[PDB]
Structure 1
Amino acid sequence: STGSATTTPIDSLDDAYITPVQIGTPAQTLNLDFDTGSSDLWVFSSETTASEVDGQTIYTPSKSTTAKLLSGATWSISYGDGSSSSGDVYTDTVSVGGLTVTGQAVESAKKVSSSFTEDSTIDGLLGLAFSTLNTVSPTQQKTFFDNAKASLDSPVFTADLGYHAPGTYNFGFIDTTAYTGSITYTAVSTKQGFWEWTSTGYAVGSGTFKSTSIDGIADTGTTLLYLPATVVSAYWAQVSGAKSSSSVGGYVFPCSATLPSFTFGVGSARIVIPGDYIDFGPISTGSSSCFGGIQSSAGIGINIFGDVALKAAFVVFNGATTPTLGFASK
């Protein structure tokens, strides 16, 4: 089997991407944030504290003839950015772009933190990291991909995120028309539960490539590119007037600037992020100071290849016996 679904930016900045997902019988379609940096499929629901719902579409398990309460199971997740959610668990039929999993754990939110409430466009998360990170207790549950994998034509999914435009998540096949050149595969460590890999270096604009190992995670659920302070300083030094602002929380730059590209290495291959991808617009409405799309990972404890990086590539998440990651230009 295979599946293919379009993923759409939630706003004009590509702050996140949403993908429609069918849950239950008859289908209830929710727009979920596909997140390769977490492993819970959770949704706003009829159980969510009323004051914490503000425009989201909700899953109502009582209206699904295939929903079954998973007795005694609860979940609670705290994301790296400080947001959180928790609740109980159903199993139900879940379909993405034509690919169906029966008995998928659908985690129903009873509580969500303010950032989730304040974002009306995201109805929940669909985790695509390794199932070892799943938070359901006392019996850990599998991700959608883990459940589907055996049925797929090939045990893979691909992320093809657009810049200020829709893109695609495919399951079970590689669309050879969706990229240029070849796909370069690189090793993955699954020890921490993430798609963790090692970039071979970087370049700023037309500058020379610096060969250096940068360990990080491929994370579709993170907006920006977080890299070591040395690398980030080298990038912003090329932008007149750019500075790190403690009050704003990162590098900012004049909105009048034309930004240089940023290249990252995948083995001997190179992925080029155009300068425009690195502009995240005014720091506050009407300001002429703009927020940078490349930021320091110092303090995070890990480098994060988020959407800024991933959207410059066609990315293969290879879930074979030994997982790997593939990157192609597009």
Structure 2
Amino acid sequence: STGSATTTPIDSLDDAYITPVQIGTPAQTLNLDFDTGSSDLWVFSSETTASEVDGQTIYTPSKSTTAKLLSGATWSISYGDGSSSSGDVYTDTVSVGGLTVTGQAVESAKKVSSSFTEDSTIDGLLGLAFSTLNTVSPTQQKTFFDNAKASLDSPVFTADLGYHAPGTYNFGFIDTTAYTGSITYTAVSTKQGFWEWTSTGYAVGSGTFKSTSIDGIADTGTTLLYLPATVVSAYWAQVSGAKSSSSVGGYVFPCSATLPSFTFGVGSARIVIPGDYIDFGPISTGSSSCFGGIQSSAGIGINIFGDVALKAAFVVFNGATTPTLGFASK
């Protein structure tokens, strides 16, 4: 079997991407943020603290004939940006673009942090990292991808994120019409539960390619590109007026500047991020200082190939027994 669903940016900056997901019987359609950096499927629900819901669509397990409370199970998660949420667990039928999984753990949020409440367009998250990161206690639960793996034609899913445009998540097959050239596959380490790979280097604009190993994670749930300080300083040194701002919390640049592209290495292949992808607009309404899409990972502890990098490529998440990551130009 296979599945295919359209993913849509939530705003004009591509801050996140939402994908419609059917939960329950009859179907309750929620727009979820597909997050390859986490492994919990959690949703706003009828159980969420009422003051913490502001425009989201909520899952109502009491109206689903297939919903079963997972007795005694709780969950609590904290994301690298300080966001958090917690609640209890149900099992229910979950379908993505025609691909159906019965008995999927659907984690009902009782408490959500402020950043989720203020994001009215995101009804929840669908984690696509490895199941070892799932926070359900005392019985860890599998991800949607892990539960569907056996019935998929091929144990893969692909991410084709659009630049200011809709994109596609595909489960079970590689669309050979969606990319140009060949797919370059690179080895993945699962030791931390992430889609963790090693980039072979980088280049700034038309500059010389620097062969150097950059260890990082493919994370659709992270907006920006987070790279080591040496690399990020080398990029922003090529933008006139660019500087690191402690008050803003990152590199900013004059909104009138033109940004160079950024190239990162996948094996012997190259993925080029257009400079326009690195522009995230004014730091405040009316400001002439603009926020950069490439930031330092020094404070994070891990390099993150977020949406800024991934939307420049066709990306294959190969969940075979030896998992691999595939990158193609598009």
Q: Which runs of 5+ in 2 are unaligned?
A: none
Work out the CA distance in 2 between the residues paired with 1:291 and 1:274. 16
Q: SS at the partner of 1:137?
A: coil
Report the secondary structure of 2:182's partner residue. Answer: coil
Alignment-derived partner of residue 264 in structure 1: 264
Instruction: State the Cα distance separating 1:299 from its structure 2 match.
Output: 1.4
1:191 matched residue in structure 2: 191
Deviation of the 1:166 alpha carbon: 0.4
Task: Kindly provide the CA deviation profile for residues 180-226 of structure 1, in whole angstroms up to 9, marking residues without a partner as x.
Answer: 00000000000000000000000000001000000000000000000
- 2:243 matches 1:247: no
CA shift, 1:152, in A, is 0.2
Q: How many Å separate the matches in 2 of 1:113 and 1:40?
A: 16
Find the residue that maps to 1:181 and give its secondary structure: strand
**TM-aligned CA deviation for residue 327 of structure 1:** 0.1
Q: Which whole-Å deviations, capped at 9, do the CAs of 1:26-52 have from their partners, x for residues lacking one? A: 000000000000000000000000000
Shift of 1:141: 0.2
State the secondary structure of the residue aligned to 2:180.
coil
Report Cα offsets for 1:50-109 as digits up to 9, x if no partner: 000000000000000000000000000000000000000000000000000000000000
Distance 2:284 2:217 in 1: 29
Report sequence identity in percent: 100
The aligned residue for residue 296 of structure 1 is 296
Deviations 1:221-245 (A, max 9, x none): 0000000000000000000000000
1:139 corresponding residue in structure 2: 139
CA distance in 1, matches of 2:49, 2:315: 37
The Cα offsets for residues 251-299 of structure 1, whole Å up to 9 and x where unpaired, read as 0000001100000000000000000000000001110000000000001
- TM-aligned CA deviation for residue 300 of structure 1: 0.6
Between the aligned partners of 1:256 and 1:220, the Cα distance in structure 2 is: 29
User: Following TM superposition, by how much is the alpha carbon of 1:151 offset from its aligned partner in structure 2, in angstroms?
Assistant: 0.3
Partner of 1:18: 18
* Secondary structure, aligned partner of 2:181: coil
Distance 1:128 1:170 in 2: 13
TM-score by length of 2: 1.00
* 1: CA distance, partners of 2:92 / 2:82: 29
Alpha-carbon distance between aligned partners in 2 of 1:314 and 1:244, rounded to the nearest angstrom: 31
SS of structure 2 residue aligned to 1:183 = strand
CA distance in 2, matches of 1:210, 1:257: 24
Measured in 2, the distance between the counterparts of 1:295 and 1:31 equals 28
SS of 2:38 mapped into structure 1: coil
Provide the aligned C-alpha RMSD in A.
0.3
Distance 1:193 1:286 in 2: 41
CA distance in 2, matches of 1:320, 1:251: 38
Residue in 1 that maps onto 2:158: 158
SS at match of 2:287: coil
Distance in 2 (alpha carbons) for counterparts of 1:271 and 1:86: 37
**Structure 1: 4+ residue segments shifted above 4 A:** none
Q: SS of the counterpart of 1:321? A: coil
Q: TM-score when scaled to structure 1?
A: 1.00
- Give the unaligned 5+ runs of structure 1: none
**Aligned counterpart, 1:278:** 278
Distance in 2 between residues matched to 1:53 and 1:277, nearest whole Å: 32
